[PDB]
Design a protein around this nucleic acid. Structure first.
Lengths: 100, 50, 77, 63
RNA sequence: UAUGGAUUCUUCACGGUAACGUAACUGAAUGUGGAGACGUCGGCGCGAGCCCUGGGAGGAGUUAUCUUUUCUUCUUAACAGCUUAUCACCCCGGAAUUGGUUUAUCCGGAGAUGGGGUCUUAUGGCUGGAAGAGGCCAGCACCUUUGCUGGCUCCGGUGCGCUUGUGACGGCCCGUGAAAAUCCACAGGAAGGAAUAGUUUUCAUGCCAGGUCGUACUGAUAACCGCAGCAGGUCUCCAAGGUGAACAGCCUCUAGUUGAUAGAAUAAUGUAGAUAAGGGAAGUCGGCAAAAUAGAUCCGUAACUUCGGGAUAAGGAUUGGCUCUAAGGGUCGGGUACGAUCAACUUAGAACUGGUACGGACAAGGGGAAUCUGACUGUCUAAUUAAAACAUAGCAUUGCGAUGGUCAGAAAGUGAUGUUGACGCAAUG
RNA sequence: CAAAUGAGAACUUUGAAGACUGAAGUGGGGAAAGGUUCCACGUCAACAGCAGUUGGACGUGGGUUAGUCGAUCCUAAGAG
RNA sequence: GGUGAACUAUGCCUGAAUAGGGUGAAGCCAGAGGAAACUCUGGUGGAGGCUCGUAGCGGUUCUGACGUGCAAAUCGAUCGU
């Protein structure tokens, strides 16, 4: 009813490869979270916090790993750094951006 | 057919055994005029129709 | 292929004189959303049937594995 | 070479069609050597033989 | 074939008013009864799978822009227990102010309604089988027929949906839609049976064995037959999305194939497919061939008729897209006349809009007035005749009462009709 | 279209593209029939009405595992 | 004197197959008119060797293709059911 689902996104590999901008990534996520069909309505429901190596998104409204991956891949396509980043989940809701 | 009888299967086995070419050494045997198997069979050419 | 209900039934089955192998399977199921518990399945293999006893109490399962005779072949996996 | 056997084996091993089985052109020699189901499974794991994705049939217009 | 269980000094069990229940709970001769065991069609109900769909957990695609997006995995066998049923049946009771009730009108003083129960287990649910399996993901030692470790595999919804199975029903017949093996049960009561032990192997557990032959593959525009790797013929099961009434017609997923000698050019004449000014059958044996018609909704529909039809008669109008409007349901109730979740596809209406187009491809009747003929449905000259020919129901005639009629056989202690009997069989028109 | 194989490639293999069958299928299986056509290796003199390195061809071999699926048992029209 | 019902004709036995529409029979329910007799209306239901039309079965016309054919009878359209 009011549980706070958390979503970890490791950004360590691209941020230490120095081709990523996790600050702008978190900005894109927070400005493009769609709640009730419109962006900008994060009424203290979906909150994005960044430390430079992990992006944590805490949600009470409708959020999903599918949406997180879809937005992340949209950002990767916009920054044309696909074939370089893969959004992959290690365990439940603790995804990671892999370079190799 | 898949569901055969043992009589039909025995005839099949005999036909498969008989269908082989001449051993090479009968040709070298003396006073021999046999050059090949003249009773050779192919499943499309001639049906044994048993 | 047959459930067991009571520990007495399990005990008569294990002394049935034709069972020699027990398999202990651990299932990490959920009873409530925030309480994933450890379920233990004691499988006694009779000649005709495979009897299985479900135990949701870890203490009960430990006392069961300790109380079964050491001559019978127990296989935990 | 002649990888008809390997294509049929890969389809039968990975449970998809020969229309989905992809065989690496650069690994023709290795695929040809691979003549058993065990070797076809080894190549599939190794990445020489890959299942092609199912061709898309969207239901967006229907929806 | 022993053990446990049940039964036994009330010898072969108890419980329930009853339908009946349970772990068992003797049962010969003989008899009897069930299952085996049965058509077809129609709607209705239920279930299985599939289809559709919401959330969530992975993977892939698209990302000039848009899309909490598109595709994709999220599975649970035989078998064992508990539970689960329309129908049926039992107990109490005693009904007109007749009530109950199906989509379908049947059922009740031969006992309805109502209350309470019993059974079949189709079928579903839970657990075991069983997550250990399968599946979807991520990572490890650097050529080498090598594995290992981590997660996840979850919770729902919907319907005149498709197909299949089942159920309770209803229609049809001068047609009423196999047999046997086999298995069980009942009636009866032969025979036998006590006590440190008898019986029960229809209760549970336990021991042993299960032979012979087939099994590969095609099953067809290349594995069969047609002289062949022949455009022919040859029985059947499963059956996704959209359009649409629709397993045709068109397009697409899974799966499969890309096979049919090729290259160049584009004369006549051909084969197949089209179009055409004005006329509109003048062509021709003859409208042959083609064209026009065509779906759906609404209106309207003649002569004649065996009252059933004719009839889609004939003949008219409409049809898109977008924005709306309205109607049509299920489940949850009552101080101390009415409310909320749950978005399901049908119908009707109104503006607005456009090169007046809109069943926009596909699909898809031409119609009318008569004459001859056969009533109709049906059948035949495989490979030149599908007809008015044959058949048909209807009508009429004929023979025959069994030691018989009609027919068969060389004969027969032989046959068909005939498992028959004049409302029949046989023979004709 | 391009690689590979090959003396030789319109026809073989692989990859890419374009297509078709479109679930009373050109899909998955069976019945009759066939009889080894199945599968692998080698190979192209003949055969596949062009070609062929390919093949249902040629040569050599491998392959069909049942108490539970059938037959086997029953009876039908009938035969005897 | 023998051999054929593997094609086909007919009977029997035992199996199997057959979208979606149109029409709308009996049976049944409600209503209206009428003094009555009765008549009429709206539903329901789902009959038929009924009908349009797939699969199937057949084979009308083109007197089309072909006619030293794919084929000793097929192919295409159009058709019957």
């Amino acid at each position: 009813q009011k549980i706070a689902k958390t979503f970890t996104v490791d950004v360590s590999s691209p941020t230490e490869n120095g081709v990523f901008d996790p600050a702008s990534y978190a900005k894109y996520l927070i400005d493009h979270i769609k709640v009730e069909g419109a962006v900008g309505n994060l009424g203290n429901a979906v909150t994005v916090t960044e430390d430079g190596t992990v992006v944590t998104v805490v949600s009470t409204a409708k959020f999903s790993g599918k949406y997180l991956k879809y937005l992340t891949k949209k950002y990767l396509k916009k920054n044309q750094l696909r074939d370089w980043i893969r959004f992959v989940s290690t365990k439940t809701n603790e995804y990671r951006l892999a370079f190799y | 057919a898949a569901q055969k009888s043992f009589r039909i299967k025995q005839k099949m086995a005999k036909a498969k055994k008989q269908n082989r070419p001449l051993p090479q050494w009968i040709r070298l045997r003396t006073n021999n005029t046999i050059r090949y198997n003249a009773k050779r069979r192919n499943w499309r050419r001639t049906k044994m129709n048993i | 292929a047959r459930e067991i209900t009571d520990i007495k039934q399990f005990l008569e089955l294990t002394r049935r004189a034709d069972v020699k192998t027990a398999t202990v399977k651990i299932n990490k199921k959920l009873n409530k959303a925030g309480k994933p518990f450890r379920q233990t399945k004691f499988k006694v293999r009779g000649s005709s049937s495979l009897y299985t006893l479900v135990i949701n109490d870890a203490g009960k399962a430990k006392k069961l594995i300790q109380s079964l005779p050491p001559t019978l072949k127990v296989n935990r996996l | 070479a002649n990888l008809r056997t390997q294509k049929r084996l890969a389809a039968s091993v990975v449970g998809v069609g020969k229309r989905k089985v992809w065989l690496d052109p650069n690994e023709t020699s290795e695929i040809a050597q691979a003549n058993s189901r065990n070797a076809i499974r080894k190549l599939v794991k190794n990445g020489t033989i890959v299942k092609k994705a199912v061709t898309v049939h969207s239901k967006s217009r229907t929806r």
